[PDB]
Each structure stands twice: as structure tokens, then as C-alpha cells.
Design a protein around this nucleic acid. Structure first.
Ligand SMILES: [Mn+2]
Length: 745
DNA sequence: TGAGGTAGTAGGTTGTATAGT
DNA sequence: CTATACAACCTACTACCTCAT
């Protein structure tokens, strides 16, 4: 076996309790309260005084050296009060920002290649390094020929306990930048339209996109009311337009939309948001090159953070505070407790299966009773490829033969499909306007000889005449007909290939068409613990003020999806009511009653995005029905990463291993080998319950292995994962009542 | 949209650790 | 009993990669 760790660095030495300088902030201008301007006063007195450390405790303010207080600042004025040695046992945050400050000050003087500053530092948690690492440990810049800049984005967040020892938690993630602007991209005549841009000067938040580019110069007064150079002289920003030459005044104005107004900002300020769309459409060699550097296995992340901490060195302002360069050998020393979860034994038609691929020889666990008649849309210039495709997937579904040749890997009749090729419904459709796609799906649902659509769509790329996917899924969800839709590229894989590169695709096709007609391929053989049903819940929030109400999902102790339940009344705000929880848990009790002739006695409630609020309702509802129950909060995206160790060597962790402290657990559920990155684990915390977190996490991981619409396991559990996929597809579900056919899959 | 994973970019909210009072 | 900030959380979108029983 092996051991697990978190990306953490011990501190050699200890912070001895330093002498600070208390300060005070009075709301001289309009901001009467001290809370709304304590951050801005912190940065202002940090900036006016040679970037010396300035700290904040809840209403007060601090420094670390005696700094002359000032009164000229218009929003607030600062006055010295006193100077004390702050006790380390009662101050964790402020010695945290001490150690964070001295990491920033020790790194600001580190230069690479002689002249070039290796790090960009604004005295915070975020430390951008201009220099990446490579796999061969070369501190090398990474630039394009065009002017794109990959960079690291290190993140210190040290904590220091009551005694004095400090633990430096790190996480390297990379960063995309470019030196060029909208200015330079106009000067080399690139069509800058439709780009996502970032205002480098004004720090407004909002997805700024380019509408047009006005032919008027940026030195001429506009509809804003003045010249734009006057606009930046009047924002205390005129040192940016002071550098402007004649040709900089020969730039022309680029208007921009922020979904609330249009601005008029000069192209020298703006800069395109380098997404992978932009790297792909503008220099694909750079994008394919840096994909090895973006995705980082834990060994290369440890090498990157080793370079970072060796560039900390030793801080002589904090009693020679050094940080170690290796991780902890065990997170027992940090607080966590590690282990690996044994994988669940899964079963289909005939018992235990060795892999999830073997089910096509074995056979599916449940099939919905009846025959399921196909029906196919396909593009009008893509006819023979589509007929070969549906021939392939229908031979794999019905006949058990893969491009004609029957094999031992696939058993026959695994879906009870009914597709007579000379008799059943095909419709062709020309790739055109949206109402053609709507009437095309309507035309396939006129002829009522279809029980499962298998449409063919153009590819997600090739942004000429658009994807037929979304209008088809909207229509086939409104009209209650499940539809597994295929790309033309996958159809051409089915037509053209003489290899298994259509077989793996075809496995996932048939698992999709099984789950969408209401059959479930695999279940667990035995779910550990004493449990009778699982109830996933989740909610959503699209943007500001938009909220998705809570759609549930109901399993059994095998993990087969009994039901999923949209509730009736929409919520108010983020917090769903008590009536929603009332009808959801009434209907899980009804549904488990209907499936099994009895009530659940143990209901494990996985959930995401719920607070510890409204636990009192859960106590109420399952005391009054005396059903003991658990609530396990499964957090989808945690920033913690987990490494592994075989005698000091860092690798990715295998799937199933966890780290656990009390009732918060992190667990890697997905197996990601090197050259594809590090696994991004699951944060799992028990809100209320009485089961140990070993069986709680075992139910979690066993529900990750039962993704019923692919062959490789979903990272999330199928409770929280399928609950969230129902919450995203909030329209495709009918309002308020149950279904079993996994449309989202 | 074969499928799932990583990762970027961007933008919101807010539960819980944490100071006084 | 109450007022924070802020590391975590969530959301949306792509691109890249590999699927071996
Ligand atoms: Mn699908």
C-alpha cells in the first residue's frame, strides 16, 4: 500500500510574537462606517509608505513597523493609537498575514535570467510567476510567437497555530496572459471583433465583449462628454496616457458591451481574455504545446511548488523562518486521516461483473418491459454514413454483432429494440434554420411508430450552420420521447472504422439508450452500512438573482434509480421552503413504498449547496415518522488536491482513496493517470447523522461507480451528480411529477 | 451532442472560522 | 446576542485527451 498527503509545507522555525503598531480609521468623508473602507485604507496606507505591511483586525488596523499616520486621504483618516506585542495564541489571522507578507517580500527580490523578475507580487495570497516550470525542471518562460503568455498562479495561504509553528499551504495553478492589447491587435490588422476582453485599467467585473470599433480617434472628445485622455487624467490614471506617442493618439476607439450599457474605452487599455477558445483560434500550436503544462500531475505540481518554496528561502525578519521543501509524509501529522476505499462489486443480469465493460457479455440489470422502436433524424447530405451508423448501433443493441461479426464480448438482445430497416422511420433534414429543426422533430413525432429517437447532429465545433442538438432535446423533452443524438463525426467513426474505435463509442451509445428508456445497467451488489434508500438533492443559481429549485433523486440500497422528483412550487431565493422538503420526502417515502412494499428505515441524504440551516425540519420530519437518517454534504469542487507517496515520490492518487478529519472528508473518485493531470477530489462532510464516515464515503464511492450512462465512472456520486444534472436541465423535466427515464444522460 | 475526466477563462454567493462586546 | 471578511463554494463556457476486456 501507499500513503496520502495534502499539498502542504511545514515551517522550519517558529514565529516569535512580534511588536506591532495599533492604528485606527475614522470615516472622514462619506463612508461613515469603518468596515466599508478598512480594506481600501489598508491598501492606501500600504501604498503610500513603500509597500510596508499593513494589517486589519475586525474594526482596527495594524502595521508591523512604526509608520507615520496621515490625514490627507479623502475617504478616511488614520491615526496612530498604540503599540503592543500581539499574543500569538490569541492571534492566528494577523500572524498569518505576517507570514504571507514576508513570503511576498522575500519573493519580490527574486529575479530569473538576470534581469527578469520571476514573480509578480501584489502582497496577497496570489503570486503569479512569470516563469513556468517544465517537466525537465527548467525555469523557462512560455510565450507564443503571437504574444500569449502562460504563467503560474501560485497561492500561499499559511496558517500559524497558537504555539508558533507555521504550516504553508500551497496550490499551483496556471494562468493565461498576453502582452498585446486591442491596440496592437489592431495595429497588426487582426479582426478583433467578437472577442472577450478584459479592461486592464478599470477593474470592473463583467463579461466585456467587443461590439464594433469606431473609426474616430481616441484623442477626440466623444459621446462620453470629453476626450478619453481627459477621462483618464480625471481618474488619477493619467500616467498611463502620459506615455502616449503620436501613433498612440492615432488609435481608434473600440466600444464594448458589458450587458448593462456600452462603454467607450481606448484600445490601448483593453486586452483579450485568453480562453482556450482564443488559444485554439489564434495559435493552435501554442495550445497543444501548453496542454502538457496546464494539466499537471501531482509530481509536477510538487516540482512546481518545490521551486516556489526554494525561492522563499529563509526569511530573516521572522526568526529565520524557513519552509520545508517536501510534503508531509502523512497527514496524520496535519490533522487528517487517510485510507483507501475498496471498490464496489457491481452486478447486471447475471451477478458480479469484473469490469464495467463486461456487461454487454453479461446483460443489463433491469430493462424496461416492452419493445423500444427506434426512429432516426440525420442530415440530408449524410445519408449513407447515417445508415451505416444506425445499422451499427442497432446490430449492437439487437443482434449483438459488431459490424456483422458476432463475438463473445457482446450478448444478443440486450435492449429489446424494434427497428425494421426497410419499414421503420427515417427522416432527413437539411442543416438550416431553427424552425426547420423544430418541424423536423415534430415530423418524427407525428408518425407514432417511434419509442426512441436516435438523431444525427453536426459536430459541436465547425461553427457554421448551427448545431441541431438543443432544439431537438427541447422538443424531445417536451414530447416525452427519449433521444440519443449522435454527432456526424461519431457517425463517420461508425461508418468508416475497421477497429474498436467505434466499439467504445458504441458501448457508451447503448448505455445511453438503456438509461434513457428507463433501464439501469448495473447496481452495487452490497452497499456498505445499514441503508435502505439514498436521496440526492441539489439546487442551482445561474447568475445574480436566478435560482434553480431543488430537484431530488431516489435510489435503493442497490443504487438503482427508483425515481427522480421535481417539486411543484418554485422557491424564493436560494433557500427552498419547507413545503418543498415536505413534498419531496413524502414522495420518496411513497416511491420506495411503491417499489418495495415497505418504508425506508435508513435514508442517507446526499446533498450539495445546502446549508446546515433547515436541519430542524429534517429532525422534525424523521422523528415524527421515526426513520433514522443521515445527511452527507457532498461538495462538488474543492480546491484541495491530494498527492501520494511511495518512499517520498509523488504520484497521482488512485481512485477511491480518501483523507478524513472528524466529519469532513476529501476523496479522489476518478482515476487519472499522469500526462492527463491530477485528480480533483470530492469534499464530503456530514451535516447530521450517526454512521461512520468510512461507510459514508463507501456509499459515496460506490455511487460514483454506478454511472448509468457511460463506461467510466462519474466523479460525483450518482445521487448528487444526477441531482445536479436534473437541476441543470430544469426545463426538460416536467413540472412537479416523477419520472424514471434518465433523459439527461 | 459517445462518454467521462482534467484544466483554463469568466462571474456570482455565503457558510463557517473568528475577532470583539 | 450581532457585524464582518474571505476561502470555499457554486455557476456557465470552451479546449484536449483517451476510451483496451
Ligand atoms: Mn448523452
Amino acid at each position: 500500500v501507499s500513503n496520502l498527503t495534502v499539498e502542504a509545507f511545514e515551517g522550519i522555525g517558529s514565529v516569535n510574537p512580534m511588536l506591532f503598531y495599533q492604528y485606527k480609521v475614522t470615516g472622514k468623508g462619506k463612508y461613515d462606517n469603518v468596515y466599508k473602507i478598512i480594506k481600501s485604507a489598508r491598501y492606501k496606507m500600504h501604498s503610500k509608505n513603500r509597500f510596508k505591511p499593513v494589517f486589519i483586525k475586525d474594526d482596527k488596523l495594524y502595521t508591523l513597523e512604526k509608520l507615520p499616520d496621515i490625514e490627507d486621504l479623502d475617504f478616511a483618516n488614520i491615526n496612530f493609537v498604540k503599540s503592543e506585542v500581539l499574543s500569538i495564541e490569541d492571534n492566528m489571522s494577523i500572524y498569518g498575514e505576517v507570514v504571507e507578507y514576508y513570503i511576498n517580500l522575500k519573493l519580490k527580490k527574486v529575479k530569473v535570467l538576470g534581469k527578469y523578475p520571476k514573480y509578480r507580487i501584489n502582497y496577497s495570497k496570489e503570486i503569479l510567476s512569470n516563469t513556468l516550470l517544465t517537466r525537465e525542471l527548467k525555469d523557462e518562460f512560455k510565450k507564443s510567437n503571437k504574444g500569449f503568455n502562460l504563467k503560474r498562479k501560485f497561492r500561499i495561504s499559511p496558517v500559524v497555530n497558537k504555539m508558533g509553528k507555521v504550516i504553508l499551504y500551497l496550490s499551483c495553478s496556471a494562468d493565461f496572459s498576453t502582452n498585446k492589447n486591442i491596440y496592437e491587435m489592431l495595429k497588426e490588422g487582426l479582426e478583433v471583433e467578437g472577442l472577450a476582453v478584459k479592461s486592464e485599467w478599470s477593474n470592473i467585473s463583467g463579461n466585456l465583449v467587443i461590439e464594433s470599433v469606431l473609426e474616430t480617434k481616441i484623442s477626440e472628445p466623444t459621446s462620453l462628454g470629453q476626450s478619453l485622455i481627459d477621462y483618464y487624467k480625471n481618474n488619477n490614471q493619467g500616467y498611463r496616457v502620459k506615455d502616449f506617442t503620436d501613433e498612440d493618439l492615432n488609435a481608434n476607439i473600440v466600444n464594448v458591451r458589458g450587458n448593462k450599457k456600452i462603454y467607450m474605452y481606448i484600445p490601448h487599455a483593453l486586452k483579450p481574455i485568453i480562453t482556450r477558445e482564443y488559444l485554439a483560434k489564434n495559435d493552435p500550436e501554442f495550445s497543444k504545446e501548453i496542454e502538457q503544462l496546464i494539466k499537471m500531475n501531482m509530481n509536477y505540481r510538487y516540482e512546481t511548488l518545490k521551486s516556489f518554496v526554494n525561492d522563499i528561502g529563509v526569511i530573516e525578519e521572522l526568526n529565520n523562518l524557513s519552509f520545508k521543501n517536501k510534503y508531509y509524509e502523512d497527514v496524520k501529522l496535519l490533522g487528517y486521516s487517510s485510507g483507501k476505499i475498496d471498490e464496489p462489486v457491481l452486478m447486471g443480469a447475471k451477478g458480479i461483473i469484473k469490469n464495467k465493460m463486461q456487461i454487454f457479455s453479461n446483460g443489463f440489470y433491469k430493462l424496461p418491459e416492452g419493445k423500444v422502436r427506434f426512429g432516426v433524424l440525420y442530415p440530408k447530405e449524410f445519408d449513407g454514413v447515417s445508415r451505416k451508423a444506425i445499422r451499427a448501433i442497432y446490430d449492437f443493441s439487437k443482434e449483438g454483432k459488431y459490424h456483422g461479426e458476432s463475438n463473445k464480448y457482446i450478448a444478443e438482445h440486450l435492449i429489446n429494440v424494434e427497428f425494421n430497416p426497410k419499414e421503420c422511420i427515417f427522416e432527413g433534414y437539411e442543416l438550416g434554420d431553427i424552425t426547420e429543426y423544430k418541424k423536423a422533430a415534430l415530423k418524427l413525432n407525428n408518425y407514432n411508430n417511434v419509442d426512441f429517437v436516435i438523431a444525427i447532429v453536426p459536430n459541436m465545433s465547425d461553427e457554421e450552420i448551427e448545431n441541431s442538438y438543443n432544439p431537438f432535446k427541447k422538443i424531445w423533452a417536451e414530447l416525452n420521447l427519449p433521444s440519443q443524438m449522435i454527432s456526424v463525426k461519431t457517425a463517420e467513426i461508425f461508418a468508416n472504422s475497421r477497429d474498436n474505435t467505434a466499439l467504445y463509442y458504441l458501448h457508451n451509445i447503448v448505455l445511453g439508450i438503456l438509461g434513457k428508456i428507463g433501464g439501469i445497467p448495473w447496481v452495487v451488489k452490497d452497499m456498505k452500512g445499514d441503508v435502505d434508500c439514498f436521496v440526492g438533492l441539489d439546487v442551482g443559481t445561474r447568475e445574480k438573482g436566478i435560482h434553480y429549485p431543488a430537484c431530488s433523486v431516489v435510489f435503493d440500497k442497490y443504487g438503482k434509480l427508483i425515481n427522480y422528483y421535481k417539486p411543484n412550487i418554485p422557491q424564493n431565493g436560494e433557500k427552498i421552503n419547507t413545503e418543498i422538503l415536505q413534498e419531496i420526502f413524502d414522495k420518496v417515502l411513497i416511491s420506495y413504498e411503491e417499489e418495495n412494499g415497505a418504508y425506508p428505515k435508513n435514508i442517507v441524504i446526499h446533498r450539495a449547496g445546502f446549508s446546515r440551516e433547515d436541519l430542524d425540519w429534517y429532525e422534525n420530519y424523521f422523528g415524527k415518522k421515526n426513520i433514522k437518517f443521515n445527511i452527507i454534504e457532498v461538495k462538488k469542487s474543492t480546491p484541495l488536491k491530494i498527492a501520494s507517496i511511495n518512499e517520498g515520490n509523488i504520484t497521482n492518487p488512485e481512485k477511491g482513496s480518501y483523507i478524513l478529519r472528524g466529519n469532513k472528508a476529501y476523496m479522489v473518485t476518478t482515476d487519472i493517470k499522469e500526462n492527463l493531470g491530477s485528480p480533483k477530489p470530492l469534499k464530503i462532510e456530514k451535516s447530521y447523522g450517526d454512521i461512520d464516515m468510512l461507510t459514508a464515503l463507501s456509499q459515496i464511492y460506490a455511487l460514483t461507480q454506478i454511472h448509468v450512462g457511460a463506461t467510466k465512472s462519474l466523479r460525483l456520486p450518482i445521487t448528487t451528480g444526477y441531482a445536479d444534472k436534473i437541476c441543470k436541465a430544469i426545463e426538460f423535466i416536467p413540472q412537479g411529477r416523477v419520472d424514471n427515464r434518465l433523459f439527461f444522460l
